[PDB]
Amino acid sequence: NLKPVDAMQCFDCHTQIEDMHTVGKHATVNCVHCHDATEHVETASSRRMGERPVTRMDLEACATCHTAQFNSFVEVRHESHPRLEKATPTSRSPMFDKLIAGHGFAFEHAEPRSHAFMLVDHFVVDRAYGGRFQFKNWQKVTDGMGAVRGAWTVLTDADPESSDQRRFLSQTATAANPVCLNCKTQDHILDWAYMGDEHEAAKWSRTSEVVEFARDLNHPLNCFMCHDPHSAGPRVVRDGLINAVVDRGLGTYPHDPVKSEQQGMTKVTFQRGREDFRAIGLLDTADSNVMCAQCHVEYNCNPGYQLSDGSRVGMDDRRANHFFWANVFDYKEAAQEIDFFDFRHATTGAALPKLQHPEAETFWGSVHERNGVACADCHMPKVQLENGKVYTSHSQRTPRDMMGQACLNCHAEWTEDQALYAIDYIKNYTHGKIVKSEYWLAKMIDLFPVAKRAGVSEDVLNQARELHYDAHLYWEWWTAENSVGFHNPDQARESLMTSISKSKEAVSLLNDAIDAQVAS
Ligand X SMILES: O=S([O-])[O-]
Rounded CA gap, 135 and 518, in Å?
55
Q: State the minimum distance, in angstroms, from the CB of residue 518 to ligand X.
A: 37
Is 26 annotated in some ligand binding site?
A: yes
Q: State the minimum distance, in angstroms, from the CB of residue 238 to a copy of itself.
A: 25
Three-class SS of 49-72: CCCCCEECCCCHHHHCCCHHHHHH
Is 375 annotated in some ligand binding site?
A: yes
The helix/strand/coil state of 312 is strand
* 80 contributes a contact to Ca ion by CB under 5 A: yes
Q: Which is nearer to ligand X, 45 or 387 (CB)?
A: 45
Phi, psi (rounded to 5 degrees) for 42 = -70, -20
Is 65 annotated in some ligand binding site?
A: yes
Rounded CA gap, 7 and 29, in Å?
10
Residues 354-393 touching ligand X, rule: CB under 6 A, are: 356-357
CB burial readout 26-59, b (16+ within 10 A) else e? beebebeebbebeebeeebeeeeeeeebeebbbb
Choose from Ca ion, ligand X, a copy of itself, none: what does 392 bind? Cβ within 5-8 Å by kind: a copy of itself
Residue (of 148, 116, 151, 150) closest to 132 by Cα position: 151
Residues 340-379 touching ligand HEC, rule: CB under 6 A, are: 357, 359-360, 363, 367-368, 371, 373-379
DSSP lists the bridge partners of residue 235 as 282
> Half-sphere exposure of residue 131, counting CA atoms within 13 Å on the CB side?
7
Rounded CA gap, 208 and 164, in Å?
11
Binding test (CB under 6 A) with ligand X, winner from 6, 23, 39, 47: 47
Rounded CA gap, 114 and 143, in Å?
11
Concatenating the DSSP letter of every residue in 253-284 gives: STT-HHHHHHT-EEEEEEEETTEEEEEEEEES
Rounded CA gap, 261 and 281, in Å?
14
Binding test (CB under 8 A) with a copy of itself, winner from 56, 166, 215, 431: 431
Is 301 annotated in some ligand binding site?
A: no
Q: State the minimum distance, in angstroms, from the CB of residue 501 to ligand HEC.
A: 21
Q: Which is nearer to Ca ion, 60 or 111 (CB)?
A: 111
Residues 459-498 touching Ca ion, rule: CB under 5 A, are: none
Q: Which is nearer to a copy of itself, 29 or 190 (CB)?
A: 29
* 515 contributes a contact to a copy of itself by CB under 8 A: yes
Stretch that binds a copy of itself, among 178-186, 292-300, 328-336, 435-443 (CB under 8 A): 435-443
> Amino acid identity of 51?
E
* Helices within 364-413 (DSSP H only): 367-370, 375-379, 403
Binding test (CB under 8 A) with a copy of itself, winner from 257, 314, 432, 457: 432
Is 368 annotated in some ligand binding site?
A: yes
Is 103 annotated in some ligand binding site?
A: no
Residues 260-319 touching ligand HEC, rule: CB under 6 A, are: 270, 278, 280, 286, 288-289, 291-292, 295-297, 299, 301-302
Binding test (CB under 8 A) with a copy of itself, winner from 238, 489, 491, 513: 489
Is 429 annotated in some ligand binding site?
A: no
Q: Helices 458-480 and 416-453: crossing angle, nearest 10°?
A: 160
Residues 189-208 touching ligand HEC, rule: CB under 6 A, are: 189-190
Rounded CA gap, 208 and 216, in Å?
12
Q: Are 499 and 477 in contact (CB under 8 A)?
A: no
Q: Are 272 and 285 in contact (CB under 8 A)?
A: no
Is 357 annotated in some ligand binding site?
A: no
The helix/strand/coil state of 16 is helix
What residues form the annotated binding site? 10, 13-14, 26, 31, 34-35, 40, 62, 65-66, 115, 180, 183-184, 223, 226-227, 230, 292, 295-296, 298-299, 354, 356, 368, 375, 378-379, 394, 407, 410-411, 487
What residues form the annotated binding site for heme? 10, 13-14, 26, 31, 34-35, 40, 62, 65-66, 115, 180, 183-184, 223, 226-227, 230, 292, 295-296, 368, 375, 378-379, 394, 407, 410-411, 487
- Binding interface with Ca ion (CB under 5 A): 80, 111-112, 354, 356
